[PDB]
């Protein structure tokens, strides 16, 4: 109707005219008014006027909320104390209380830092629990613990909407955009509401991000309560880190009440199901042993044939193909080929001793040292191969047991906060052999022992290797692989100030600045901290061309989940390695057409280090489309590094730290073949 009878009602100031006109505006408030509430210019004078004044506050917040304001809107509601499934309730509650309480929670959340916004927040929480439209009231009430009582207050009936929707989009957006300190509340209150709920593997991902020791006990008495079993033991062992399976095996070695998680959970059973079923369900032919094992020659593709042997797999013909194949081989190739029998026998624990026993304590030093390396590769829970290698260890100058220290300290690091192996490692770093891989497998081995620690540590282990690292300024490769294990000990942090402690005590001329930028790389595993992304943009132009390599190489670790922004203009640069940096940033992802599109340009290069570097990620990213780029490499070349690396890529084709270390240590392939003796023992390959 027209505003002729009802428009001049705001002019009088009589109390009854307000106490009957305002209920009429409540009856007509189902659509607000006939129009966009153009009465503001006439009713704004009524601000100074003061029985039923909360209803005038309701009209005032209704019109001020109706047209425009950012702070004056919720004042009549915080002064009103609201009192007195419908269209009117959806209007003044849903959108008006959604935007109104949203801007009040934002303005008071950023302004002051009371109970009024908590009571209004719980009232809107209940009213939107009545509205039942998720993820929007949730996504609005994330910023205003409050979220704890919000979830435990809301989670009564709906399990898959709040769990799947809220935990999916809020977990992904929480690791993407939300800072870290709220993810801990996500993990603890999600531990509560998922502790009340079934489908335990989501709480096992809460153990993947939490890295807690009580969660695995509650999920083993709860998975024990609900009797698949060996399959969740398998991806249980895949999900768990180094710490919680040893603490898990000590508390479950204490009780566990059934001995079956002591059977499963600590060795032999994430291998026991696979290998017999792998030999059963899979059938690989012999024309790749014969063909791929036939295009090898010149004693380097022979090393690619030790790669054939160790990383070929059903059929084990090339394993038992006569003899003299290791006798024609070289010394570091004798390490790689002696460890190849370790790679072919990741199963058959009883057969491993009776197969490597021939190569043990033989006439050749590399046969016995690579044999103990094989003993470290074949298993990770036997721990009975230590004594014959550990007893021989002491050499103090050059002797074989330092190479048995390579294969046995590295293989025991693959087998492994121990307190006897590092005390044995004290004369190892104190020895300081000229062989790079001594401190290489020392730092990497103690780091793999120390990955996943509780907010890291600054103990005298890595402090001692920092002081003895800076002791001798020789063979900067030590200054390259020692910060590897340093940053591996830095792994597991959530709030460690070890970047500032190292900023104090590891800073020097550019012989420890690579250690500083390595602690910077491993200390920023990844969260929403774009300040280090613009810091990445600023320090990316540094004159030093190695902190560009690793510090810019951190991109694949940081944004590994939101891979839509990972394609960048790194290939368009003109430095020395940047194309290599993006080339590593491809990694082992499923490799959609855009990644192979980047391999179209990255595949064609003239430098042997980049043409050598491209087939590694080219074949890791694809594990009638696999062997075609290989023939493209045959069209590229037809040096030795590119051929060995492209056959090695044929064999490659056919945040877990176990898959993150081996290649971040592999970023130093541009050296002598001695490093290629440690290239073959990468455990990142599944």
């Amino acid at each position: 109707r027209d505003k002729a009878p009802v428009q001049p009602q705001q002019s009088p100031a009589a109390a009854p005219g307000g106490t009957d006109e305002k209920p009429s505006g409540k009856e007509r408030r189902d659509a607000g008014d006939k129009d966009k509430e153009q009465e503001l210019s006439e009713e704004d004078k009524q601000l100074q006027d003061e029985l039923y004044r909360p209803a005038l506050e309701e009209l005032r917040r209704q019109i001020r909320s109706s047209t425009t304001s950012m702070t004056s809107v919720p004042k009549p509601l915080k002064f009103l104390r609201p009192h007195y499934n419908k269209r009117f309730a959806a209007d003044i509650i849903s959108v008006l209380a959604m935007t109104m309480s949203g801007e009040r929670e934002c303005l008071k959340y950023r302004l002051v830092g009371a109970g009024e916004v908590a009571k209004e927040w719980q009232e809107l929480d209940d009213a939107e629990k009545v509205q039942r439209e998720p993820l929007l009231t949730l996504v609005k009430e994330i910023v205003p613990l409050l979220m704890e009582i919000e979830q435990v207050d809301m989670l009564e009936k709906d399990i898959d909407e709040n769990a799947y929707a809220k935990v999916c989009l809020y977990l992904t957006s929480c690791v993407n955009y939300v800072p870290e300190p709220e993810n801990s509340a996500l993990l603890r209150c999600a531990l509560g509401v998922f502790r009340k709920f079934s489908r335990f593997p989501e709480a096992l991902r809460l153990a993947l991000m939490l890295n807690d020791m009580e969660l695995v006990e509650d999920i083993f008495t709860s998975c024990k309560d609900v009797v698949m079993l060996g399959r969740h033991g398998v991806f249980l062992e895949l999900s768990e880190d180094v710490e919680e399976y040893e603490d898990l095996t000590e508390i479950m070695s204490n009780v566990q009440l059934n001995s079956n998680f002591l059977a499963l959970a600590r060795e032999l059973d994430i291998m026991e199901p696979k290998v017999p079923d792998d030999i059963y369900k899979t059938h690989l032919e012999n024309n790749r042993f014969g063909g791929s094992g036939s295009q090898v020659d010149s004693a380097r593709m022979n090393l690619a044939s030790s790669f054939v042997n160790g990383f070929v797999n059903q059929d084990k013909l090339l394993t038992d193909d006569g003899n003299k194949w290791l006798y024609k081989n070289k010394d570091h190739g004798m390490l790689s080929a002696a460890a190849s029998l370790g790679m072919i026998l990741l199963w058959d624990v009883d057969g491993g001793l009776t197969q490597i026993d021939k190569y043990l304590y033989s006439s050749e030093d590399y046969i016995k040292s690579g044999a103990l390396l094989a003993c470290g590769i074949v298993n990770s829970g036997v721990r009975n191969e230590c004594d014959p290698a550990l007893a021989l260890l002491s050499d103090y100058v050059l002797h074989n047991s330092n190479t048995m220290r390579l294969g046995s300290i590295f293989g025991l690091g693959l087998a492994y906060n121990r307190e006897d192996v590092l005390t044995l490692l004290l004369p190892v770093m104190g020895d300081s052999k000229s062989s790079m891989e001594v401190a290489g497998v020392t730092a990497l081995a103690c780091g793999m022992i120390a990955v996943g620690s509780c907010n890291g540590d600054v103990t005298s282990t890595i402090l001692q290797t920092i002081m003895e690292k800076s002791e001798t300024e020789l063979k900067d490769t030590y200054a390259r692989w020692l910060p590897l294990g340093l940053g591996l000990n830095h792994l597991g942090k959530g709030e460690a100030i070890e970047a500032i402690l190292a900023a104090l005590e590891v800073v020097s001329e550019p012989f420890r600045s690579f250690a500083n930028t390595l602690v910077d790389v491993c200390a920023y595993a990844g969260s929403g901290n774009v300040l280090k992304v613009q810091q990445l943009l600023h320090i990316c132009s540094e004159h030093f061309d190695s902190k560009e390599k690793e510090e810019d190489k951190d991109k694949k670790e940081k944004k590994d989940k939101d891979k839509k922004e990972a394609p960048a203009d790194m290939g368009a640069h003109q430095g020395v390695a940047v194309l290599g940096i993006a080339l590593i940033a491809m990694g082992e992802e499923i490799g959609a057409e855009m990644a192979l599109r980047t391999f179209g340009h990255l595949l064609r290069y003239g430098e042997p280090t980049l043409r050598r570097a491209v087939p590694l990620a080219l074949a890791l990213i694809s594990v009638s489309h696999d062997a075609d780029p290989e023939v493209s490499y045959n069209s590229i070349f037809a040096a030795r590094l590119a051929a060995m690396l492209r056959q090695l890529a044929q064999y490659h084709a056919k945040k877990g730290t176990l898959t993150l270390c081996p290649y971040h240590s592999d970023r130093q392939l541009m050296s002598q073949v001695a490093v290629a003796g440690l290239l073959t023992v990468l455990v990142s390959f599944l």
Binding site: S624, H625, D628, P629, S632
Partner: protein
């Protein structure tokens, strides 16, 4: 055309899809099929080319306009199709509205270049090439015996039935009134292909756009029929 679409579906969707009865059978016809139809216009040919877009890479090159629009560079773009079809093979090569022959002597040598180069001279076949044109008699016989060895399909002349069915598919996405009958349309037309009924659809929706209405009364359906009925 259910058998005609399941024979091209089973014909070209045997490689790289459902592979347990393709590589173990030892057949491998890496030549594709040749499509042609009296209606043409790419409507049924695109309704059969879309049947392979489910799990595959699609590559649509309509006509030889991009070749005959500049100096006679020749079969170099076809060699580029051989290097992208060799270094990247999921893509079925779909060529529609082949009007190259309609200089001519260079079309014979790029026809011999796609014929010779398409057979897989360097590998055990590499790429499936589905060809689609309007008239099959104008093509030279060099693509018949060496190229086609698997199958080519012919489209029958309905006269009434698939004129009604093609009317149903053209008017499936559009809105037809209750009084708009089909017998007077499939009967009043005398040897009209799919392009003409696509043109009466074009005046139906276009003349409906002229009055900014979404509905077309019978009187506005004949008054709309006058649009292309005068334009054709």
């Amino acid at each position: 055309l259910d058998n005609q679409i399941q024979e091209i579906k089973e014909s070209v969707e045997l490689p790289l899809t459902h592979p347990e009865y393709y590589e173990e059978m030892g057949i491998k016809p890496p030549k594709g099929v040749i499509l042609y139809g009296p209606p043409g216009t790419g409507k049924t040919l695109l309704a059969k080319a879309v049947a392979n877009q489910t799990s595959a890479t699609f590559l649509r090159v309509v006509g030889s306009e991009l070749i005959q629009k500049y100096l006679g560079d020749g079969p170099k773009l076809v060699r580029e199709l051989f290097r992208v079809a060799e270094e990247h093979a999921p893509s079925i090569v779909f060529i529609d509205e082949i009007d190259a022959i309609g200089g001519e002597r260079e079309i014979q040598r790029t026809m011999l270049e796609l014929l010779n180069q398409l057979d897989g001279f360097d590998s055990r076949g590499d790429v499936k090439v589905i060809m689609a044109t309007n008239r099959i008699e104008t093509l030279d016989p060099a693509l018949i015996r060496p190229g086609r060895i698997d199958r080519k399909i012919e489209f029958p002349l309905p006269d009434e039935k698939t004129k009604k069915r093609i009317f149903q598919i053209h008017t499936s996405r559009m809105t037809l009134a209750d009084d708009v009958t089909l017998d007077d349309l499939i009967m009043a037309k005398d040897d009209l292909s799919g392009a003409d009924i696509k043109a009466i659809c074009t005046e139906a929706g276009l003349m409906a756009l002229r009055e900014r209405r979404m509905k077309v009364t019978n009187e506005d359906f004949k008054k709309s029929k006058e649009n292309v009925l005068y334009k054709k």
